[PDB]
């Protein structure tokens, strides 16, 4: 059928998702649901546990954390780029559009996938070896303590959809191939790819979550919260560049930030 | 067991046809008879960009190099899809799948590039273009040194007169190499390659029965490929002391491995 092609596209993206992202939601949930003994994380909830964490978990304060996010976000950009090239049709696009799709897509994907590593109490860090609590992060001096709470508020609502990795692989593919990004040269080929991806996502959610009514529509409506959080995130960054003139940002990230 | 070798051969040929747009058959038609814009000097290349719409347009030697980056990245995705059709490949360890492609795309890129080359140049852009061998080696160092070893290999490789049905199995043999570093389960890889080698052997005896030991000679070319690729990557390390734009887009840098 035409839907056999949609299933092959879904399988293809899931395969590439596993190869590109080392820490899946399936692994994050096994670590968080306290399943076992070999996978349990060390919990950073204050400065001493944080001090004992660097000893044990292997990776001022608040600025030590902030540059940790920078470095992991840079690694995430790398992983998202590799995944993007696997999306059929992406690498055949105008190279300026490729750059543009990655530039405006990376932050929406980072905090989509970060939700996989969060519960209401905190977030897994450092390949899941560590867990940082929501309270300790909200306790960081301003304005660093303002970074995390919106993500937690989004993650709780996003995670109630109970998507698995196979669902997420298509959803991230849809996000990358967004024809409404500023400065795109040929919007139509991008939209034709997203059309096929949206078709693939719809069949996937309906087959994977048959009792979940209108999950497709509810997933698409999550973009409002996604884009609101990116907007707040970049404003937070601008406050940092002014009060924190003695702290460098990463060039890959600064070029992504340009005109955000 | 001979029917399943031929079944395997036909399956790979069909998959190769679907995965790679410009086949050797059509490339050879364009290079002889039954027409490409030719790029022979600085002026013709500037005209060719206003002619053929290059999707990578954002020094001339660097602009050609960036074009090779763009097309190589496209070919990785074509080769990846072709690898998925090889019986047994997807059932392999996911990390081994990734390792085979990562260390194998370069050998395949220059195997298939031979299809688009003769002693005088190389087809580009689905055949809409053609870049002369003279112009490419006229490029300033070290960019003028990338392609000459490829032409030398290609003139020899093409003298074997392989067709797409031959090359389909040959490329499959290259992907399923058990000697790539970092593999975790070598047994089923070489198990599949030995099965592809039997199919390649029978294919060449049926399709070139007058070509004595063509099978052995094809295998000898695979070591010529290894040398091409080792020399190629060593040259693109020297590049990161020439094409080093201290003000380059990091996202472009992120895209351009492969
Ligand atoms: O929520 S953020 O908006 N972004 C965010 C980005 C990533 Cl990649 C991230 O993941 C990691 C992973 N490993 C880590 C290892 C060591 C230290 C921190 C890590 C963070 C997390 Cl937990 C948060 C945000 C939280 C803040 F606490 C600070 Br300070 C700034 C900051 F940007
Ligand atoms: O021979 S190479 O070793 N690699 C190589 C790789 C591919 Cl995919 C290739 O095919 C194309 C196809 N379309 C193109 C369109 C525009 C511009 C270049 C294209 C190259 C070719 Cl002609 C060469 C090599 C040749 C050099 F001229 C330069 Br500068 C560096 C370089 F790596």
PDB file of N, CA and C in Angstrom, chain B residues 17-58:
ATOM      1  N   UNK B  17      19.712   0.061  -8.846  1.00  0.00           N
ATOM      2  CA  UNK B  17      19.021   0.944  -9.784  1.00  0.00           C
ATOM      3  C   UNK B  17      18.145   1.944  -9.037  1.00  0.00           C
ATOM      4  N   UNK B  18      17.425   1.478  -8.016  1.00  0.00           N
ATOM      5  CA  UNK B  18      16.512   2.357  -7.292  1.00  0.00           C
ATOM      6  C   UNK B  18      17.256   3.357  -6.413  1.00  0.00           C
ATOM      7  N   UNK B  19      18.448   3.000  -5.932  1.00  0.00           N
ATOM      8  CA  UNK B  19      19.161   3.832  -4.969  1.00  0.00           C
ATOM      9  C   UNK B  19      20.058   4.880  -5.614  1.00  0.00           C
ATOM     10  N   UNK B  20      20.650   4.590  -6.763  1.00  0.00           N
ATOM     11  CA  UNK B  20      21.590   5.517  -7.392  1.00  0.00           C
ATOM     12  C   UNK B  20      21.017   6.042  -8.699  1.00  0.00           C
ATOM     13  N   UNK B  21      20.691   7.339  -8.787  1.00  0.00           N
ATOM     14  CA  UNK B  21      20.003   7.864  -9.978  1.00  0.00           C
ATOM     15  C   UNK B  21      20.780   7.676 -11.273  1.00  0.00           C
ATOM     16  N   UNK B  22      21.995   8.214 -11.328  1.00  0.00           N
ATOM     17  CA  UNK B  22      22.804   8.194 -12.544  1.00  0.00           C
ATOM     18  C   UNK B  22      23.614   6.904 -12.563  1.00  0.00           C
ATOM     19  N   UNK B  23      23.172   5.946 -13.369  1.00  0.00           N
ATOM     20  CA  UNK B  23      23.839   4.660 -13.484  1.00  0.00           C
ATOM     21  C   UNK B  23      25.001   4.756 -14.466  1.00  0.00           C
ATOM     22  N   UNK B  24      25.841   3.716 -14.478  1.00  0.00           N
ATOM     23  CA  UNK B  24      26.947   3.691 -15.429  1.00  0.00           C
ATOM     24  C   UNK B  24      26.436   3.706 -16.863  1.00  0.00           C
ATOM     25  N   UNK B  25      25.391   2.923 -17.147  1.00  0.00           N
ATOM     26  CA  UNK B  25      24.816   2.886 -18.488  1.00  0.00           C
ATOM     27  C   UNK B  25      24.454   4.283 -18.981  1.00  0.00           C
ATOM     28  N   UNK B  26      23.768   5.067 -18.150  1.00  0.00           N
ATOM     29  CA  UNK B  26      23.377   6.399 -18.594  1.00  0.00           C
ATOM     30  C   UNK B  26      24.572   7.347 -18.611  1.00  0.00           C
ATOM     31  N   UNK B  27      25.506   7.182 -17.673  1.00  0.00           N
ATOM     32  CA  UNK B  27      26.727   7.980 -17.697  1.00  0.00           C
ATOM     33  C   UNK B  27      27.513   7.742 -18.978  1.00  0.00           C
ATOM     34  N   UNK B  28      27.614   6.483 -19.415  1.00  0.00           N
ATOM     35  CA  UNK B  28      28.358   6.191 -20.636  1.00  0.00           C
ATOM     36  C   UNK B  28      27.649   6.763 -21.855  1.00  0.00           C
ATOM     37  N   UNK B  29      26.313   6.736 -21.855  1.00  0.00           N
ATOM     38  CA  UNK B  29      25.560   7.332 -22.954  1.00  0.00           C
ATOM     39  C   UNK B  29      25.859   8.819 -23.078  1.00  0.00           C
ATOM     40  N   UNK B  30      25.937   9.522 -21.947  1.00  0.00           N
ATOM     41  CA  UNK B  30      26.197  10.957 -21.973  1.00  0.00           C
ATOM     42  C   UNK B  30      27.610  11.251 -22.464  1.00  0.00           C
ATOM     43  N   UNK B  31      28.576  10.394 -22.131  1.00  0.00           N
ATOM     44  CA  UNK B  31      29.966  10.634 -22.498  1.00  0.00           C
ATOM     45  C   UNK B  31      30.285  10.266 -23.942  1.00  0.00           C
ATOM     46  N   UNK B  32      29.378   9.590 -24.645  1.00  0.00           N
ATOM     47  CA  UNK B  32      29.630   9.216 -26.032  1.00  0.00           C
ATOM     48  C   UNK B  32      28.596   9.839 -26.962  1.00  0.00           C
ATOM     49  N   UNK B  33      27.493   9.130 -27.203  1.00  0.00           N
ATOM     50  CA  UNK B  33      26.450   9.630 -28.075  1.00  0.00           C
ATOM     51  C   UNK B  33      25.091   9.138 -27.632  1.00  0.00           C
ATOM     52  N   UNK B  34      24.061   9.816 -28.132  1.00  0.00           N
ATOM     53  CA  UNK B  34      22.667   9.490 -27.828  1.00  0.00           C
ATOM     54  C   UNK B  34      22.405   9.438 -26.325  1.00  0.00           C
ATOM     55  N   UNK B  35      23.234  17.192 -23.842  1.00  0.00           N
ATOM     56  CA  UNK B  35      24.691  17.288 -23.869  1.00  0.00           C
ATOM     57  C   UNK B  35      25.229  18.218 -22.787  1.00  0.00           C
ATOM     58  N   UNK B  36      26.288  17.786 -22.102  1.00  0.00           N
ATOM     59  CA  UNK B  36      26.716  18.474 -20.874  1.00  0.00           C
ATOM     60  C   UNK B  36      27.355  19.833 -21.122  1.00  0.00           C
ATOM     61  N   UNK B  37      27.132  20.756 -20.182  1.00  0.00           N
ATOM     62  CA  UNK B  37      27.926  21.973 -20.144  1.00  0.00           C
ATOM     63  C   UNK B  37      29.306  21.638 -19.607  1.00  0.00           C
ATOM     64  N   UNK B  38      30.328  22.031 -20.347  1.00  0.00           N
ATOM     65  CA  UNK B  38      31.705  21.669 -20.047  1.00  0.00           C
ATOM     66  C   UNK B  38      32.369  22.802 -19.284  1.00  0.00           C
ATOM     67  N   UNK B  39      33.159  22.439 -18.277  1.00  0.00           N
ATOM     68  CA  UNK B  39      33.890  23.379 -17.439  1.00  0.00           C
ATOM     69  C   UNK B  39      35.370  23.103 -17.653  1.00  0.00           C
ATOM     70  N   UNK B  40      36.053  24.014 -18.348  1.00  0.00           N
ATOM     71  CA  UNK B  40      37.445  23.820 -18.721  1.00  0.00           C
ATOM     72  C   UNK B  40      38.390  24.875 -18.170  1.00  0.00           C
ATOM     73  N   UNK B  41      37.888  26.031 -17.747  1.00  0.00           N
ATOM     74  CA  UNK B  41      38.740  27.079 -17.202  1.00  0.00           C
ATOM     75  C   UNK B  41      37.942  27.880 -16.182  1.00  0.00           C
ATOM     76  N   UNK B  42      38.599  28.888 -15.602  1.00  0.00           N
ATOM     77  CA  UNK B  42      37.955  29.735 -14.602  1.00  0.00           C
ATOM     78  C   UNK B  42      36.668  30.350 -15.136  1.00  0.00           C
ATOM     79  N   UNK B  43      36.702  30.833 -16.380  1.00  0.00           N
ATOM     80  CA  UNK B  43      35.547  31.528 -16.935  1.00  0.00           C
ATOM     81  C   UNK B  43      34.366  30.583 -17.127  1.00  0.00           C
ATOM     82  N   UNK B  44      34.622  29.367 -17.617  1.00  0.00           N
ATOM     83  CA  UNK B  44      33.526  28.435 -17.861  1.00  0.00           C
ATOM     84  C   UNK B  44      32.882  27.964 -16.564  1.00  0.00           C
ATOM     85  N   UNK B  45      33.648  27.892 -15.473  1.00  0.00           N
ATOM     86  CA  UNK B  45      33.066  27.442 -14.215  1.00  0.00           C
ATOM     87  C   UNK B  45      32.121  28.489 -13.641  1.00  0.00           C
ATOM     88  N   UNK B  46      32.512  29.765 -13.720  1.00  0.00           N
ATOM     89  CA  UNK B  46      31.607  30.842 -13.331  1.00  0.00           C
ATOM     90  C   UNK B  46      30.332  30.801 -14.157  1.00  0.00           C
ATOM     91  N   UNK B  47      30.459  30.526 -15.456  1.00  0.00           N
ATOM     92  CA  UNK B  47      29.279  30.442 -16.308  1.00  0.00           C
ATOM     93  C   UNK B  47      28.442  29.217 -15.962  1.00  0.00           C
ATOM     94  N   UNK B  48      29.100  28.128 -15.561  1.00  0.00           N
ATOM     95  CA  UNK B  48      28.388  26.897 -15.263  1.00  0.00           C
ATOM     96  C   UNK B  48      27.509  26.984 -14.035  1.00  0.00           C
ATOM     97  N   UNK B  49      27.845  27.874 -13.101  1.00  0.00           N
ATOM     98  CA  UNK B  49      26.994  28.065 -11.932  1.00  0.00           C
ATOM     99  C   UNK B  49      25.727  28.828 -12.297  1.00  0.00           C
ATOM    100  N   UNK B  50      25.846  29.837 -13.163  1.00  0.00           N
ATOM    101  CA  UNK B  50      24.660  30.456 -13.742  1.00  0.00           C
ATOM    102  C   UNK B  50      23.942  29.514 -14.697  1.00  0.00           C
ATOM    103  N   UNK B  51      24.647  28.523 -15.245  1.00  0.00           N
ATOM    104  CA  UNK B  51      24.016  27.485 -16.049  1.00  0.00           C
ATOM    105  C   UNK B  51      23.389  26.444 -15.130  1.00  0.00           C
ATOM    106  N   UNK B  52      24.185  25.468 -14.692  1.00  0.00           N
ATOM    107  CA  UNK B  52      23.691  24.457 -13.765  1.00  0.00           C
ATOM    108  C   UNK B  52      23.555  25.070 -12.378  1.00  0.00           C
ATOM    109  N   UNK B  53      22.372  24.931 -11.785  1.00  0.00           N
ATOM    110  CA  UNK B  53      22.093  25.490 -10.464  1.00  0.00           C
ATOM    111  C   UNK B  53      22.733  24.600  -9.406  1.00  0.00           C
ATOM    112  N   UNK B  54      23.876  25.034  -8.880  1.00  0.00           N
ATOM    113  CA  UNK B  54      24.549  24.308  -7.813  1.00  0.00           C
ATOM    114  C   UNK B  54      23.869  24.600  -6.481  1.00  0.00           C
ATOM    115  N   UNK B  55      23.479  23.543  -5.771  1.00  0.00           N
ATOM    116  CA  UNK B  55      22.784  23.706  -4.500  1.00  0.00           C
ATOM    117  C   UNK B  55      23.712  24.093  -3.356  1.00  0.00           C
ATOM    118  N   UNK B  56      25.027  24.029  -3.555  1.00  0.00           N
ATOM    119  CA  UNK B  56      25.997  24.310  -2.506  1.00  0.00           C
ATOM    120  C   UNK B  56      26.519  25.740  -2.541  1.00  0.00           C
ATOM    121  N   UNK B  57      26.000  26.581  -3.430  1.00  0.00           N
ATOM    122  CA  UNK B  57      26.518  27.937  -3.581  1.00  0.00           C
ATOM    123  C   UNK B  57      26.045  28.790  -2.413  1.00  0.00           C
ATOM    124  N   UNK B  58      26.995  29.409  -1.719  1.00  0.00           N
ATOM    125  CA  UNK B  58      26.725  30.087  -0.458  1.00  0.00           C
ATOM    126  C   UNK B  58      27.110  31.564  -0.508  1.00  0.00           C
TER     127      UNK B  58
END
